[PDB]
Amino acid sequence: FLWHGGSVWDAWFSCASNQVAQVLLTLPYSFSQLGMLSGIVLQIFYGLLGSWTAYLISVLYVEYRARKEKEGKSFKNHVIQWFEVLDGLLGSYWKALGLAFNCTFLLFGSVIQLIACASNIYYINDHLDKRTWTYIFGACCATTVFIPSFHNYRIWSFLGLGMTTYTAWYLAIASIIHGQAEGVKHSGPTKLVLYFTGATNILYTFGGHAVTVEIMHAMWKPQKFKYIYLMATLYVFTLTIPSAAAVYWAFGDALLDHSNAFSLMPKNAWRDAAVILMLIHQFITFGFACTPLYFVWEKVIGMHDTKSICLRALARLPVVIPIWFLAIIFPFFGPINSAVGALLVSFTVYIIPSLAHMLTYRSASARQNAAEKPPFFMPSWTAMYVLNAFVVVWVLIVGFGFGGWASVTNFVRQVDTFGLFAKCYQCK
Ligand SMILES: O=C(O)COc1ccc(Cl)cc1Cl
Ligand code: NA
């Protein structure tokens, strides 16, 4: 009860901002690297852990606002940010950590959208290789230095949800109708590097929810908290499990060579519709990631105020040129999710939110005068502390130690094979 979350519409507007658009096409690859038994258990595991960490971020936001409003403060005409909460609760070293990590991740999450945009357009008009489509789409994305901000974020998310729901159910039904071939093989785990570069792509997937609660996070007065609101957290499962299971079931071990699943499906108007919807979706996730970087760069350089559109744009172009060169040089759609999710997501989404919560409520004085008692599904404090320590140690060893070695070895293998400035990655 009294969950500071809102009504049914705001509650579903939080599951809408659970971006799983682009990574949806690289999950059969991970299944072919792991097998059927490990692919499902790990998806459920990481989905539950992601929901837990999102809850942690929420309770920390509420704790900070509640502490600040008591000593005398007005939060009117001023939205709170993540690094501000970290600075207010822990100190300045945490304000530096939660800024460096959240800026590096936002830099590397747009290279991926540019790569995917240049990759999916190849399965409509394959007269120009993927590097020329990267030239063209980078020149198109370098025009976001003219769009100031977004006037509305509700409609974009509510349309992205449907654009994802069409593709996640085309990929399953087309694969079922196509059936199995004659002499396809489902070999499970063979090498270690492959198992652990698949597990990290699965870790990456379920950290997109908590990453938005670290940037926008709108909150308001509490409501009565109908308990049906929880049934919107487990709606990404009907998007990710059937589509990834039914493509691997049909196409076997031909997927450890094709990271984009559109390359195996038979061409039809439905496939063309899904490519276009995915392009429209991945063109929105690029601006929603490049806007905070623009804001932070303008604040840092000391030029927040600008009246002409020609001055803002011109000053705002050391931030989109490395996002372009990095997409041109390393165009590895699918092997890059593992590296990014092993080096940045494991710290941004999992270890830091659970370490801040452990370090905040250390003393009994901080635990008796708390803004929110422990939830109904976790009564004691020892339960929360044990769960946090487990999350920290697990993501530290399996997510960073093994995942890191495996994913970086795979990323270097791709460069050894295809070279730098590759012309067409995984084209016949
Ligand atoms: O389209 C994508 O890139 C997949 O969505 C995500 C998945 C994981 C994380 Cl951390 C962030 C995002 Cl935006
Ligand atoms: Na991967």
Side-chain angles (χ1 to χ4, degrees), residues 83-104:
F83 61 93
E84 170 174 346
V85 171
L86 283 182
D87 192 305
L89 282 176
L90 294 174
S92 322
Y93 300 149
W94 290 85
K95 191 210 177 187
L97 256 62
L99 188 62
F101 265 106
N102 274 263
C103 276
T104 329

Side-chain angles (χ1 to χ4, degrees), residues 239-263:
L239 256 52
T240 38
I241 291 184
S243 81
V247 172
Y248 175 54
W249 168 84
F251 290 114
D253 271 315
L255 289 164
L256 39 76
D257 214 6
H258 302 90
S259 325
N260 202 317
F262 281 142
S263 38

